[PDB]
Design an enzyme around this catalytic site. Structure first.
Site, mmCIF file in Angstrom:
data_model
loop_
_atom_site.group_PDB
_atom_site.id
_atom_site.type_symbol
_atom_site.label_atom_id
_atom_site.label_comp_id
_atom_site.label_asym_id
_atom_site.label_seq_id
_atom_site.Cartn_x
_atom_site.Cartn_y
_atom_site.Cartn_z
ATOM 1 N N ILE A 200 -4.607 -2.259 -2.160
ATOM 2 C CA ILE A 200 -5.182 -3.084 -3.239
ATOM 3 C C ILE A 200 -6.113 -4.123 -2.559
ATOM 4 O O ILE A 200 -5.886 -5.335 -2.576
ATOM 5 C CB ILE A 200 -4.071 -3.812 -4.071
ATOM 6 N N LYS B 72 2.210 -6.670 5.598
ATOM 7 C CA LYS B 72 2.893 -6.707 4.286
ATOM 8 C C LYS B 72 4.388 -6.415 4.467
ATOM 9 O O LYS B 72 4.783 -5.626 5.329
ATOM 10 C CB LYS B 72 2.320 -5.668 3.332
ATOM 11 N N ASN C 215 -7.840 9.276 5.121
ATOM 12 C CA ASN C 215 -8.804 8.676 4.238
ATOM 13 C C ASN C 215 -8.187 7.354 3.721
ATOM 14 O O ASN C 215 -6.949 7.266 3.519
ATOM 15 C CB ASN C 215 -9.090 9.596 3.064
ATOM 16 N N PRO D 41 0.850 -1.213 0.000
ATOM 17 C CA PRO D 41 0.000 0.000 0.000
ATOM 18 C C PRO D 41 0.876 1.250 0.000
ATOM 19 O O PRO D 41 2.109 1.152 0.135
ATOM 20 C CB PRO D 41 -0.817 -0.046 1.261
#
Lengths: 103, 103, 103
Positions: free
Chosen positions: C64, C32, C97, C1
């Site tokens: 993702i 990750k 966000n 990310p």
């Protein structure tokens, strides 16, 4: 909502009080209290628009709701005019995208 | 469409004519006249990518249509190669996201 | 990310090792490996938030996949706390966000 403005005009061409003015304007336009608004202005950018590096502005407004066609029209008019007047960019060189911040 | 490039390479490592070149390239690649294109290059950024701060680039292309798989492939190849050559970033360090500017 | 942070705190108020720390944190939080993470910190910005230009931060995390409610909560807590402590911003002035980078 949050209004982001990316512009190639110099930081010194941005008036004292511009972030405060823009903030108050969005509060008027959207009917939301200043508490629910964020403004982010980024000057001195390297950008071309419609082929040239004449003064321009790429902006985006992010809201937690879908804006209607009448609102889009009313927001663009108000916002482009404010930006062209205070920062001296031709109205046809200010582009605004609207995003449903929560969609 | 609009192509945004965020990079940690210095502003002085960006060639004179880079925004013009990139602009013309997108016009070729997309079949759109320079009039419908905007490019925004932001150098000198503080960024890590795959764990390190080696030269890298996070980019995004925004279009008013859905790009197809063949286009994605063709755009990435062309765009990564242009960025790696002119700004000297390893090809595996240039990432591009595609957004349907109106979806 | 990819985690992007836009802040009005000065570049010099950002600690040596902040991008490395934040990177490792996201790797822990998301499960990750550092290889799949990118961090982009942009200081010295002109911004108002809830009406004022007190120190603040507008951030966005792009993944993702869709983040779940428990993850959102856990990410915000961890991320706001890290940002408030290291950059000295009031926790209620750090907004994040979440975007499904591929949706």
């Amino acid at each position: 909502p949050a209004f982001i403005v990316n512009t190639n005009v110099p930081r010194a061409s941005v008036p004292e009080g511009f972030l405060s003015e823009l903030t108050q304007q969005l509060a008027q336009a959207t009917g939301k209290p200043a508490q629910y608004i964020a403004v982010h202005v980024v000057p001195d950018q390297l950008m071309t628009f419609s082929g040239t590096s004449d003064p321009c502005a790429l902006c985006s407004l992010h809201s937690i709701g879908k804006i209607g066609g009448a609102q889009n029209r009313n927001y663009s008019k108000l916002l482009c005019g404010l930006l062209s007047d205070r920062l001296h960019i031709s109205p046809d060189r200010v582009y605004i995208n609207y995003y449903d911040a929560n969609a």
